[PDB]
């Protein structure tokens, strides 16, 4: 997990060992940030937008940084055209595609694209909608827009996009109506779990089949959360970080997708919102 | 202090 708010925005990387279980610092971020995104590409991770929420400024980030693991320091990369507070990214081929967020009151419905063997960003065709809090998830080499918020209202909506064409077209709605949500795919296709629908955290999970262009619901978990942070690599996707409308919480839940049940695993030292989370 | 992800104002 990279990034994070609690009372202010957070440089914290620091990792986690679902086979071990202890809590261990990292480098920290260069600058503080949170709302942001967290990916992979090669290995490397890659921290991207966001905001840094301090006691002396409220700055949105177009800045993402690059962190290699094998030696345990983050180098800065070519920012964006804008700032993006509140993103969502997909790795497809391993290239960066940076969706919506907000700069201030505007809200973004423009995407952009990175290459880390190039390191650079170039504009692409614009969502149909306005989305900052979007999930973003990646399948079949698909980069599918989830949810978030246009300003206005709080979205079930998703659409998807075409690396061939530059063009995005809706599909079908969630269930429910998800900004802030923690959206990956799992084996199959897309899952949306948990964001704020404009009265209540949401503790239900939706997931989408592409197939029967479908959503259904699987079970939800023991708590709720927006602003979480999600990421997949053994299967059993795990929730980290996010908020409850009083408690910045301190829960990660994981859940099976064979008997379909969530339990609290562990927690880190403090509770904390806004992640952007990989593993490598 | 804002709903969806706790920041401040």
Known sequence: ?280 | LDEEAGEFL
């Open chain 1, 1 to 280: 997990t990279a990034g994070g708010y609690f009372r202010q925005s957070l440089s914290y990387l620091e990792a986690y060992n679902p086979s071990d279980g202890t809590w261990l610092r990292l480098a920290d971020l260069q600058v503080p940030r949170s709302g942001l995104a967290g990916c992979v590409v090669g290995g490397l991770l890659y921290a991207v937008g966001g905001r840094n929420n301090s006691p002396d400024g409220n700055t949105d980030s177009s800045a993402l940084d690059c962190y290699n693991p094998m030696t345990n320091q983050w180098s800065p990369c070519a920012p964006m055209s804008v700032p993006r507070n509140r993103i969502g990214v997909g790795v497809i081929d391993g290239h960066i595609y940076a969706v919506g967020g907000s700069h201030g009151c505007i809200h973004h419905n423009s995407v952009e694209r990175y290459e880390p063997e190039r390191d650079e960003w170039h504009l692409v065709a614009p969502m149909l909608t306005r989305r900052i809090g979007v999930g973003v998830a990646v399948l079949n080499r698909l980069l599918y827009a989830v949810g978030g918020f246009d300003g206005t209202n709080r979205l079930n909506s998703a659409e998807c996009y075409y690396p061939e064409r530059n063009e995005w077209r809706m599909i079908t709605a969630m269930n429910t109506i998800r900004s802030g949500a923690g959206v990956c795919v799992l084996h199959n296709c897309i899952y949306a779990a948990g964001g704020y629908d404009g009265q209540d955290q949401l503790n239900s999970v939706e997931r989408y089949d592409v197939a029967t262009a479908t959503w259904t619901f699987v079970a939800p978990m023991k708590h709720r959360r927006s602003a979480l942070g999600i990421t997949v690599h053994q299967g059993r996707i795990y929730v980290l970080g996010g908020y409850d409308g009083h408690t910045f919480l301190d829960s990660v839940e994981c859940y099976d997708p064979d008997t379909d049940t969530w339990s609290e695993v562990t927690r880190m030292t403090s509770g904390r919102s806004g992640v952007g989370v990989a593993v490598t």
